[PDB]
């Protein structure tokens, strides 16, 4: 019979669920080797993660997956599995199950197909338009903000300077908050939020965010880069 | 007091590693709102983390983060946590301490000057540098790729081959013996810690990414791969 590693159990996954690999062998008996899991993230290279030799019960994870990640094996079934938990955007990858040649063999002769694991929405989606706008000093600056779903007037403005945190300008859509200079302004128009500088002051020129605090979890708008018209800056 | 959120904890960790923020709080009794953590990747959007409510402990995480974080608080000392297990390189951002402005007032009007925390890649683990990246060659070139270890690993190197969608195929072992059914222009040689393969003809089904890997610890470490692509055309 021939030598086979076939994968199993991939799809996609919300970020922090869980999901179980399996492996089945044939050819060969799994009780007699090590059985090694190898993934590799899309258009990147190569990383263990676990072995197990099912014969003396031994296993090893690496340190970016211990305590997550829980390697088992069945060999009644001549199986082996691979229990992912709170997985992560950086778990995306293709997981291959291996194993070494055995007795002094120590290189992996027989690699799996593979299988992918994608992991990922209910989630209030804020969408800012534009990106990004330049400007000179004393014009009119409008950014708009769309709300996937209705949010009220549940909505902030928030403005960041490059190194600093975000600062308030405007809560519940076009109230302006306390200390914060009279040319900005908001309003709403259904799911359609708009921020306003009436006449654009050199320290204005930052990032701007959108954020709605309708529901939770709060989410915010990709956010505006308002610059000076030219290049560079 | 003015209102004040003062962060303090990040710092260098390497993929895997744990991580303790702190979010000392004055001018406010934390008891009183919620306290929040929010991130930002370096140069992406803001992110919100997690959220506590110190009065009866209630919290809620974004799913990017459940089971990996846990925010905490202790109001003896008007201060929160965030405990960051199982960090990774998604984790790397600046966290920013934040507050909801209380009852009825749902914005977060007071942030801190935020904490980096960066997850690195420079590690214990012994490092396959290959060169080059990336190599256009023509059919019946001769081909070298080499790789340098980071500290001895005897002749426990192994090559292999990937081809697009497919997995990786056991191509050299120990070094230099060529593996059975593997055509005879591949060889491994060993100099010190530099191991080189090499392709005496490269042949049109040559072409693919090659990885070498150590085992001679535990874990095996894999080079970053060489993709040779091909110089020409024969349609």
């Known amino acids: 019979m021939e030598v086979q590693l076939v994968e199993s159990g991939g799809g996609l996954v919300q970020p922090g669920g869980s999901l179980r690999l399996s492996c089945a062998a044939s050819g060969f008996n799994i009780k007699d080797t090590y059985i090694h899991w190898v993934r590799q993230a899309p258009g990147k290279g190569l990383e263990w993660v676990a072995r197990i030799y099912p014969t003396n019960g031994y296993t090893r994870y690496a340190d970016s997956v211990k305590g997550r990640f829980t390697i088992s094996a069945d060999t009644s079934k001549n199986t082996a599995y691979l229990q992912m938990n709170s997985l992560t955007a950086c778990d995306t990858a293709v997981y291959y199950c291996?194993?070494?040649?055995?007795?002094?063999?120590?290189?992996?002769?027989?690699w799996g197909q593979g299988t992918l694991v994608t992991v990922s929405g209910s989630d209030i989606q804020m969408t800012q338009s534009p990106s990004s706008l330049s400007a000179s000093v004393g014009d009119r600056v409008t950014i708009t903000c769309?709300?996937?779903?209705?949010?009220?007037?549940?909505?902030?403005?928030y403005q960041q300077k490059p190194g600093k945190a975000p600062k308030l300008?405007?809560?519940?859509?076009?109230?302006?908050?306390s200390g914060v200079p009279s040319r900005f302004s908001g309003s709403r128009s259904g799911t359609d939020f708009t921020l306003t500088i009436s006449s654009l002051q050199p320290e204005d020129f930052a990032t701007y965010y959108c954020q709605q605090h309708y529901t939770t979890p709060p989410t915010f708008g990709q956010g505006t880069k308002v610059e000076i018209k030219g290049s560079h800056h | 007091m003015e209102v004040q959120l003062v962060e303090s904890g990040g710092g260098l960790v390497q993929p895997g590693g744990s991580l303790r923020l702190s979010c000392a709080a004055s001018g406010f009794n934390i008891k009183d709102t919620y306290i929040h953590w929010v991130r930002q990747a370096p140069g992406k959007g803001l992110e919100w983390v997690a959220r506590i409510y110190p009065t009866n402990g209630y919290t809620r995480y974004a799913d990017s983060v459940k089971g990996r974080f846990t925010i905490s608080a202790d109001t003896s000392k008007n201060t929160a946590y965030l405990q960051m297990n199982s960090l990774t390189a998604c984790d790397t951002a600046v966290?920013?301490?934040?507050?909801?402005?209380?009852?009825?007032?749902?914005?977060?009007?007071?942030?801190?000057?935020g904490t980096l925390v960066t997850v690195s890649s420079g590690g214990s683990d012994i490092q396959m540098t290959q060169s080059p990246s990336s190599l256009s060659a023509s059919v019946g070139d001769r081909v070298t790729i080499t790789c340098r270890a980071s500290?001895?690993?005897?002749?426990?190197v192994a090559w292999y081959q990937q081809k697009p969608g497919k997995a990786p195929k056991l191509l050299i072992y120990?070094?230099?013996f060529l593996y059975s059914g593997v055509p005879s222009r591949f060889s491994g040689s060993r100099s010190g810690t530099d191991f080189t393969l090499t392709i005496s003809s490269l042949q049109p089904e040559d072409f693919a990414t090659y990885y070498c890997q150590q085992h001679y610890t535990t874990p095996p470490t894999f080079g970053q791969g060489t993709k040779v692509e091909i110089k020409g055309s024969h349609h």
């Open positions: 120990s070094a230099s």
């Open positions: 291996s194993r070494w040649g055995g007795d002094g063999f120590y290189a992996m002769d027989y």
């Open positions: 500290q001895d690993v005897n002749t426990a």
